[PDB]
């Protein structure tokens, strides 16, 4: 819980608990007992809804796909949906198992093949690569059930890189890849339908659990432009004769006059 408020009478002190220093890079400890006359207040609120586990552990949407010919593919990443990508880009390193739930409006009999990294996925339905011996697969009938399965932390390091300030190839190389793109791939999910019944919309809800965030950061203050790319200059009109005009798309509203708001 949060601490209670202590009483505070009139104080005439020579050590001001108000005059701090912003330059020292430390925040002030000034509680309202230092500025005014407080009363004892049994305060029992908790920030239990703010800890990383309950903050991120809510099973948001990570990606949508569309079964074209009873087949669709999705490479696991949080980079497509800005709302959850921002909550992740709060922190630098994150370590979490994830719990994938598939909300599909299809009807019939579907199959999900979690392709671990480094192998070839089925390039279409009724491919030979679907008969797999070791690639873990999930069968389900969308009516009567939502398929769900946990992927443990597949990291190749002690955490996930939300931001990576490095490359993967040495200096003189030519196809160097900035960012977190090479640092990790979580495989991919290949969906197919064995029947013909339902729609084609598949939503992948992923819930980070057993989270352990590592380095806080300034939350993203600009709308994204690409994935894995942390650009923010939006090039809105590529066709017209202004393509070289780059919007900014921030969220700082302006007020008409200071000292009047």
């Amino acid at each position: 819980v949060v601490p209670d408020t202590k009483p505070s009478g009139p104080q005439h002190t020579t050590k001001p608990s108000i005059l701090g220093a912003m330059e020292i890079g430390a925040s002030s400890n000034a509680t309202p007992e230092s500025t005014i006359e407080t009363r004892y207040v049994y305060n029992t609120n908790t920030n239990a809804e703010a800890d990383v586990e309950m903050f991120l552990g809510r099973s948001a949407l990570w990606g949508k796909v569309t079964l074209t010919r009873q087949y669709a593919k999705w490479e696991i990443n949080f980079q497509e949906q800005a709302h959850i990508r921002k909550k992740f880009e709060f922190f630098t390193y994150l370590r979490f198992d994830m719990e994938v739930t598939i909300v599909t409006n299809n009807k019939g009999l579907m199959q999900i093949m979690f392709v671990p990294p480094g192998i070839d996925h089925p390039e279409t339905h009724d491919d030979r690569k679907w008969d797999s011996a070791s690639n873990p697969s999930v069968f389900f009938q969308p009516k009567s059930g939502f398929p769900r399965f946990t992927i443990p932390f597949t990291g190749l390091a002690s955490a996930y890189y939300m931001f990576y300030d490095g490359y993967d190839k040495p200096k003189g190389s030519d196809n160097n890849e900035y960012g977190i793109a090479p640092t990790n791939d979580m495989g991919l999910l290949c969906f197919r339908t064995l029947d013909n019944s339902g729609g084609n919309d598949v939503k992948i809800y992923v819930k980070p659990k057993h989270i352990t965030a590592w380095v806080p950061r300034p939350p993203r203050a600009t709308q994204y432009t690409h994935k894995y790319s942390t650009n923010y200059h939006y090039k809105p009109n590529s066709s017209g004769p202004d393509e070289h005009v780059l919007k900014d798309r921030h969220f700082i509203k302006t007020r008409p006059l200071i000292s009047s708001a």
Partner: protein, 235 residues
Amino acid sequence: GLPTRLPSGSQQFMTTEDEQSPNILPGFHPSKKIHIPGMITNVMHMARVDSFIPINNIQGEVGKVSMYYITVTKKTVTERILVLPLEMSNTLFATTLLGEVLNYYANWSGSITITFMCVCDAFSTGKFLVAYTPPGGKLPEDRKQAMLGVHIIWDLGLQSSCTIVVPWISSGFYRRTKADSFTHGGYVSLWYQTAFVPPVSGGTGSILATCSACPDMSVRMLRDSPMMEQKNELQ
């Protein structure tokens, strides 16, 4: 067979539930957890770090670093320098660490810290009155009215930063994040206490301000934040 019943709410997928799920990839051994410095356990610990307020966010300053400071000078008469309406949805707070954490939560209840710093020469001095008009109270628009609420008076010398602790004055127990008329938080107005006297005739001083949360600040009812949008599709 043991008699079981499936009450309502037992074939559904609620995004915010807490269930166990079958581990795909069994026997999998995750890489060891090494000590990385800086581990965080609670986002409110982010909301307790001071962050600058864009106090000069006028239509010519947004997008420029000059939107973080306002310029004060020697005026013969008292003036209202700056007003910050305590609304954690107002673009002043909604862009700082405090506000950007609090905007994920529908309600917040606690005390705020606001640390004013004056960046000027070593010979410039002055006194400012930092007043907080409690909820239900009109915007002061006169120092004789502003000084009746929670206010402090800070000098300027050998130490430049000063903190007003906006205390938790409210009727209810929680104050809505998106400011409305029922739970409004009041205003924080900065007034010339005696002046700002620079060492020259036309000297200026540039005032900044940071906001943070006192240890007794709390939040509830996590929601989407209005401080992020997605209109395009990320490719």
